[PDB]
Amino acid sequence: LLGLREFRLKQDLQGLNSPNMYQDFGHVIAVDNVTASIDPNSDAAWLWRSTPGDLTKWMGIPWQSDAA
Amino acid sequence: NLSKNVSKHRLAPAMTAKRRNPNVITNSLRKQLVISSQGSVSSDNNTQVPLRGKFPAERHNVLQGSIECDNEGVLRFYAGNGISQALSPSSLNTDFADNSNWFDDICDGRVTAVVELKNG
Amino acid sequence: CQYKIYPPLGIARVGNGPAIKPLSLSTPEVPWAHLYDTNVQYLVTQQELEQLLEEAFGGNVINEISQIKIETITGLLGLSHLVPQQQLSRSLDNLQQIKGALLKVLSDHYLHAVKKQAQNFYIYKCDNPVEKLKLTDGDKVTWRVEVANKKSFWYDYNNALDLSLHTQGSGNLSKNVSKHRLAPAMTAKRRNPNVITNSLRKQLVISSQGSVSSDNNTQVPLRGKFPANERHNVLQGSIECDNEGVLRFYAGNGISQALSPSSLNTDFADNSNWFDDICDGRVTAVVELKNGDTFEIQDEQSSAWVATTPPDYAPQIEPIVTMYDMVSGAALKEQDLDNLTTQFSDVFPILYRLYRMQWVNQADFTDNAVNTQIRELNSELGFAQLLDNSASAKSLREGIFNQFRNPLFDQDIDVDDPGQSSNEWVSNSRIIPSKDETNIAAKPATSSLKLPFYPNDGIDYPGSPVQWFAIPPFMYQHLQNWAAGDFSVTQVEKESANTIEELGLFYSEQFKNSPNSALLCARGALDALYGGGFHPGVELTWPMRHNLIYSQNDYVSSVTPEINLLGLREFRLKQDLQGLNSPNMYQDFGHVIAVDNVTASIDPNSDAAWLWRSTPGDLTKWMGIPWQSDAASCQAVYTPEDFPIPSWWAANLPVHVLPLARYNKFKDSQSADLPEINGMTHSIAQGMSEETFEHLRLEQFSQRLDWLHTADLGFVGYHAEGGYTNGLIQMVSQWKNMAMVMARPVENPGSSGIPNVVYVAYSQADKD
Amino acid sequence: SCQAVYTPEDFPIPSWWAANLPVHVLPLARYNKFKDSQSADLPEINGMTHSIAQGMSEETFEHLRLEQFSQRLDWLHTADLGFVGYHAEGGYTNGLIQMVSQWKNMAMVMARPVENPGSSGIPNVVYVAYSQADKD
Amino acid sequence: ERHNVLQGSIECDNEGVLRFYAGNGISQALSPSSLNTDFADNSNWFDDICDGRVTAVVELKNG
């Protein structure tokens, strides 16, 4: 039935106090930034290590616009 | 989940994306755009605790959710009331995804616990 | 190398005036030739039409008037190529009486029309161009032009792709912009994205070609179709050759249209379903002499390019940084600018052009401290202090230099989040907000806004230093050398520098008497075009500021032996020698174009190098479609602070003008022999004190009108909406009725403070 | 909606109720560029440096005063009524919508003194439009 | 300037029957930017709807 898995998100253990809580890539984000984030040693790898708000921040603001 | 063909043959190139609310400049001031809250609950008291932030952080109260723990130790997490709003009434949300001057009560965050047994 | 075509890049501007010499204009062949010429007529005049009718009568037309004393009459004056046959006949049919009747039909079609600015192309004989080709009996030259428009085929214009191109820096663009991510290049999607496959997208390209020779002066139309093979005929231009072998190229009539009337052009640059009649392409020739010697002028070192563009609505007002400056800057490396040598004549153009922007831009009339200091110096005949390179004048030069924005874009910034992915250079001067507002307090600016007060390549990014225009690195280097005292100037220049106007007239005389007509003509074709900001601009855009687009770009000489005036260059565009038949005529990069494609194009051996080897349509495909959308978006960009008002490209699309109505209320002196003086009755005008009379003159002189209001751009009428988008929509038909700026005399300004030459904007709406 | 009603002819511009909802006003920014006389002992005179203001001829100085005095601004632009920003729409309807919040920020006209007009032609009492947007 | 409007077409057969055809359904504004955004009253627009008067005369062989 497609199986059962044990999975956990990557988490920034400092949460709201993380130094990357307010990280971004400047005036634009682009695939080049995601390419750089693949390397866990890079200044972009924080993209994968969630702080609060990181899962839903991509979504439409406000959500009711996306729904309609 | 995703074939290498999509990037390899450039079937749907990723676009660049500009900032939302781009008139707020400097990382320090853009922190005002983030709504955050936190709370704790334990099995010794089942009183519900609101998770309430501010936007910008008039200023509006934003109920991001609610948490309660029952005497068996199960955490129950409620989301917000579905209230979205703009800082000015005339700012309409005419875009499917990117509307400046708007906030909503969606959130996501970190869930941790500490078990304290009677023997210490 | 025996013959070459000049100019290497010619420019012709659309207009609804006729494609005939007496009623058209010519692209500048000598820079600064007519900046104070108060006789200019850039709109078709009644007298020109009357005169055109005189030449159509003359000798043996009066003979024939007495002979059939009606298709006799209309066939004998070759006017059917100007006005269709019907109206000509019905004019006389219905009722010297002939002249008035024919004049009325010509007036209906052309009175006040925007004259076409046509480019003259010349063959020069080479020893290095010594002299124009001189045909003798039996010599002939044949010209060939092939042009295209690919705007509807090409990609959206979001911002200049080279803002993210890794570079060591040029004379035109600092490496800081890309290095510090000051204004990232955006990806851009296709225009008209619903027509898929390259074969079907070929239909989106308009193209045409034509040939003329010195044996027959008949004009030949360059007519394409859109879509290409209801189809629409598109007149891209017209060509003719005179008996001396000079080719004259006329642009189209300024007709832009959508395939469906309900498709409105609501975007500044990217409107699907639209075509316009702008074009560009390849100019070649063959010289054939008496003896049978034939000389092909086909290779990129000796052949030429033509591009058509929107009208210049203030031909005597030069952009502060021109397309020729881009050519000159493209040859320079940023890291070597400390080797540049500076004369005063290399910095005067910056001061002179900014000073003359007062006629087209309110901020440069009443909100520009440098222009006010120039006026102060002029008022005491003290301008020549600016030519003094000694220590006693250093604080004077520095005070002016320090007000200019540095194209390093590294001043008036705080480094935000150093060492983070969010590392950012944030301006602490005034920003230009996005229209998507956020009701959060702006951050107070701590640094004065630097000059000039115009938006720039990076406008999309609030807080980027690149939101605002800077003179390019090499021109800033000249100004910095001037400020430092490291510049030379001649004593005879000093003798002509008591006012800025006197020195400007002197420098104009130096251009006029420079003996290199070929190079002057190459420079003149480009010195009236904009060189920034490129968003996308007016005529051409950012590829022009890269040396990659030129197959040759060499400094040749100063304008005169002792006066450089920014110099004369021999340059040539890179050309695909197959023109319309190039296998790369219809090349693209797939669903989007991005800076990665430009990076791949730098290597001339790579698969993307075709980006720089121009085929017809490649210079103009980047620009807004239709161009009128871009023109109507090329005005003020308002900040929350009222003043100064930022303006985009005001030298060629004015923003605040001096209307004819105001001219007619200040041109007269109190002693004028006129029943009405400056809009007053003779008796009222002469009854007031002289002091009050001169005050009223200056008040009228000071009334500057939004150029968008010089025709009906959607704000006329009770509860009319006005606004940005209706201007874009209405400019498609109204571009031809917009105010045209022309120098005019004030015979006796007295002590009113009004200069003897003013620049007045003529339109039907603003005339009284 | 109580402003200009533009005709095909540019001039005169018709205005509805301009004595109480002004249409073209003389902003504070301009007042501060003509209120001073040339001999004023200030490091800045009419928005010029002391040195530039006093180095120019008296005739030029008074001309600059009248030029500034003559710069009149659409009252609708004395606050952000929907036309501010890159590609802002502006126009009639946004004016209507934005006035609900912006009425309190519109320019307020107040009589102000010119202590020595000299020969400039500027009257001793001018009426000056104060708002945050138009103040400099 | 000025547009031809085909309001209809008429033909008569040899029996004397008149057949009346309406126009082609072509509506247009004098400027392409004038959009017909109101259900009934749009200035600058024409259409090819029409109506009017039909008369005849019968001529017999006997005069």
Ligand SMILES: [Mg+2]
């Ligand atoms: Mg110009």
Ligand SMILES: [Mg+2]
């Ligand atoms: Mg009142």
Ligand code: NA
């Ligand atoms: Na000295």
